[PDB]
Amino acid sequence: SRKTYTLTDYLKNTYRLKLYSLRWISDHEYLYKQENNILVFNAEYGNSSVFLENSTFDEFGHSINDYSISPDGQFILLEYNYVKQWRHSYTASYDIYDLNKRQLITEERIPNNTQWVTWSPVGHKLAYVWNNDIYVKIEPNLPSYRITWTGKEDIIYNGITDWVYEEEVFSAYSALWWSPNGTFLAYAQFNDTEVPLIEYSFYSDESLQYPKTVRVPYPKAGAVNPTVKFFVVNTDSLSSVTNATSIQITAPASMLIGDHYLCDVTWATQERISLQWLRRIQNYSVMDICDYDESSGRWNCLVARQHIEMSTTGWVGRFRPSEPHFTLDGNSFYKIISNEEGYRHICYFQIDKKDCTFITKGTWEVIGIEALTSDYLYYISNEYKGMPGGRNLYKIQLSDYTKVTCLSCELNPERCQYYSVSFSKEAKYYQLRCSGPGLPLYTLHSSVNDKGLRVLEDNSALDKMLQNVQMPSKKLDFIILNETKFWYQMILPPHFDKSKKYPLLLDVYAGPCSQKADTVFRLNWATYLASTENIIVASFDGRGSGYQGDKIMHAINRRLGTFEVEDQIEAARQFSKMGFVDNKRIAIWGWSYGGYVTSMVLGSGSGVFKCGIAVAPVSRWEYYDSVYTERYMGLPTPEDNLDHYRNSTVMSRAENFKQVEYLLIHGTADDNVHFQQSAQISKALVDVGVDFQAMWYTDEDHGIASSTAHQHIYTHMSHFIKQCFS
């Protein structure tokens, strides 16, 4: 009939998804920014007004890529001169616009090249980092107060994370946390003094005669890690002639005994803060609860009021220990932890009591706690229909755990099976975001009766466009591997005929706690391969997968590169045994961890796969960062796990590549997974006489996301797959 979803539709993004990104400014109003003007909406009735006109800054003389209204409704922080750094960090220029007098504050403005900026939770206080030092501005137009003086590029970081903490433990650039009402400002300091540096070339624009060398503090497995220190300062007792005084919170002793990390800071009350520490051997973590001492000024963390979280089967937390949610009086909290059965559920704690109480249970897991009222506890879980790849919002009554209600399950079971949620300040209202299996659906509700107020966006426009295109379908099912069931998904070509034999591409990631089989609606490269090239694209969640309990997830503990690749191979082998797969044309590909798995599978000598594509893969764990690698592999020492670090490299399987067609791709400026990793893969293949294909992307990083490089890499990969299958 009509056309198919082509490679150009994907690259040029002709079929666009509509979103509904709102920013709650209260328990009743949210701002719905548009391509032009920002509106303010009344959640209850839906009426709206204009918060500030698009023309308001026609003559700002700079392109504004982001705004950040103070919790005051009094000021607007304007971000411009954006310059991306790593995955989360970046620098920019900031201007404060006074909403009152509609004037642009021109005095004592924030420095250019500022690293981080954030308002206080309540007032209009400002805290920012610049040149690695922390500054506080009690008033938009008032002079700033330097809180720290030790900041030093690539060495001492105050209020901001270094490379590894940004990527692997905080997933943020910021390392500062205001107290509930803004009185205190807590921050972290990182010392990269002896951390080795990764060095690589950056060629820049053509006009650069000499390539520059980029050097950054990056600790590879087994190397010297950065050290951290926590501090708290009172933003009210700050003079303007005396240097602010920061109180350091240290220990615990079970942590200070060796290398450790700071993996979480959460304020309980206005004078109570919780901190979670993790040993370098991420087997054991400790939460300290510290209270402010009025007539002392310092903070005390009572031993006995601390809680230990450890595992004997694997590491702690999914990626790190979960975050606690404190009750009004801060004398108790709720947090996700692994069951005695290995399933993650909500445990209820009394700050001075060792044993907690699980308020949920079952062979499913709580993905996260979304909101806590004195009445109910709202959380997301994959309980419904026993599908680990589904996400639903549930509320449990704190007075009767026996009373848990599903708020998303039945809204539209056919179209919606994967939800995310966004509550207002007091959780009076909430916005549900459905992202599959049907077209993304955004709606608004009220917590009191859980009444559906209205549809914010149903993507009806895209719906109309897609009915004139031959789209692929998605199969989400499971297979059985010795007692246990493992899920998978397959993007099936239009007019799928189970009688016919199709070529198959295994799309892989498979890193610990990952999930490639779900109910999410996507418009990606796989859509095109299936719609236009009639290729089945499958993904399988084997041992190591998350959201299914620890027996499965911790199965690859200390053994990266074993079961998770073997299982990907076993899936393929079983997919071909379903009858609609041409086992002479089965390929595999992945990015980053997926690149590692792809390479390991292709070098396994299974002969199952004809060809494969590895994009920015890890080739050996000693090349990757410590925080992530060590979490699963332990330490690369003969006393610990060295032997396996050495047995799970790609280069040792070089000889086996003689049987396959391989495409190795990598960005030269990858700061995460260093080009080095592929450099060594290609070298081992050359030393063994194996022919293969390669492609480097100069000055591109781990995402290979610039507009041009992105279109080029997927175009190159399409050709490779088409050639391998035709």
Ligand X SMILES: *C(N)[C@@H]1CC[C@H](C#C)N1C(=O)CNC1(C)CCN(c2cc(C(=O)O)ccn2)CC1
Tell me the CA distances in angstroms from 287 to 70, 186, 255, 308, 655, one per residue in order.
Answer: 31, 16, 11, 6, 48
Closest CB to a copy of itself among residues 250, 723:
723
| Partner touching 302 among a copy of itself, ligand X, none, CB below 5 to 8 Å by kind | none
Give the nearest distance from C-beta 595 to ligand X in angstroms.
8
Cα separation, 517 vs 537, in Å, equals 11
Please give the structure tokens belonging to residue 74: 């009094």
Cα separation, 393 vs 386, in Å, equals 14
Cα separation, 351 vs 337, in Å, equals 16
User: Considering 447, 539, 576, 592, which one is annotated as catalytic?
Assistant: 592
Q: Which of 14, 171, 193, 460 binds ligand X (CB under 6 A)?
A: 171
| Partner touching 689 among a copy of itself, ligand X, none, CB below 5 to 8 Å by kind | a copy of itself
Run of H or E residues at 98: strand 90-98
Q: Which of 267, 326, 394, 593 binds ligand X (CB under 6 A)?
A: 593
Closest CB to ligand X among residues 173, 575:
173
Contacts of 32 by beta carbon, 8 Å cutoff, 6+ apart? 20, 21, 22, 38, 39, 40, 41, 48
User: Considering 567, 670, 671, 701, which one is annotated as catalytic?
Assistant: 670
358 is a contact residue toward a copy of itself (CB under 8 A): no
| Strand residue runs (E) in 99-191 | 103-104, 116-119, 126-130, 133-137, 145-146, 156-158, 176-178, 184-191
Give the nearest distance from C-beta 125 to ligand X in angstroms.
27
Cα separation, 16 vs 545, in Å, equals 31
Run of H or E residues at 596: helix 593-602
Per 3-state DSSP, the chain is made up of helix, strand and coil in percentages (nearest 5) of 20, 35, 45
Residue 592: active-site member: yes
HEC readout, 276-294: EEEECCCCEEEEEEEEECC
Bond preceding residue 140 cis, omega within 30 of 0: no
Give the nearest distance from C-beta 638 to a copy of itself in angstroms.
14
Q: Count the neighbouring beta carbons within 10 Å of the beta carbon of residue 169.
A: 21
Q: What angle do CA 329, 119, 26 make, to 5 degrees?
A: 60
Q: Which of 28, 551, 558, 716 binds a copy of itself (CB under 8 A)?
A: 716
Q: Nearest residue by C-beta to ligand X?
A: 592
| Partner touching 45 among a copy of itself, ligand X, none, CB below 5 to 8 Å by kind | none
Closest CB to ligand X among residues 669, 673:
673
Residue 670: active-site member: yes
Q: Which of 167, 370, 541, 661 binds ligand X (CB under 6 A)?
A: 167
Give the nearest distance from C-beta 624 to ligand X in angstroms.
6
Residue 541: active-site member: no
| Partner touching 168 among ligand X, a copy of itself, none, CB below 5 to 8 Å by kind | ligand X
Please give the structure tokens belonging to residue 321: 């220990």
Q: Which of 151, 314, 388, 511 binds ligand X (CB under 6 A)?
A: 511
Contacts of 285 by beta carbon, 8 Å cutoff, 6+ apart? 263, 276, 277, 278, 279, 308, 309, 310, 316, 317, 321
Is 520 in contact with 418 (CB distance < 8 Å)? Answer: yes
Instruction: Candidates 130-138, 164-172, 339-347, 353-361: pick the segment binding ligand X (CB under 6 A).
Output: 164-172
70 is a contact residue toward ligand X (CB under 6 A): no
Q: Which of 672, 678, 682, 718 binds ligand X (CB under 6 A)?
A: 672
Closest CB to a copy of itself among residues 179, 678:
678
199 is a contact residue toward a copy of itself (CB under 8 A): yes
Instruction: Candidates 130-138, 436-444, 533-541, 713-721: pick the segment binding a copy of itself (CB under 8 A).
Output: 713-721
Per-residue contact string for residues 622-651; x = within reach of a copy of itself by CB under 8 A = xx-------------------------x-x
Amino acid identity for residue 412 in this structure: N
Binding to ligand X (CB under 6 A) within 607-666 occurs at 618, 628
Instruction: Candidates 146-154, 166-174, 382-390, 709-717: pick the segment binding ligand X (CB under 6 A).
Output: 166-174
Is 531 in contact with 494 (CB distance < 8 Å)? Answer: yes
Contacts of 547 by beta carbon, 8 Å cutoff, 6+ apart? 365, 367, 382, 388, 389, 513, 515
Q: Which of 674, 701, 721, 725 binds a copy of itself (CB under 8 A)?
A: 674
| Partner touching 567 among ligand X, a copy of itself, none, CB below 5 to 8 Å by kind | none
542 is a contact residue toward ligand X (CB under 6 A): no
- Computed over its alpha carbons, how large is the radius of gyration of the chain? 26
Question: What pairing do the DSSP bridges indicate for beta strands 581-591 and 611-615?
Answer: parallel
726 is a contact residue toward a copy of itself (CB under 8 A): no
Which residues are the active-site residues? 592, 670, 702
Binding site for a copy of itself (CB under 8 A): 196-201, 203, 206, 209-213, 220-223, 620, 622-623, 649, 651, 668, 674-676, 679-680, 682-684, 686-689, 691, 693-699, 708-709, 711-712, 715-716, 719
Binding site for ligand X (CB under 6 A): 167-168, 171, 511, 592-593, 618, 628, 672-673
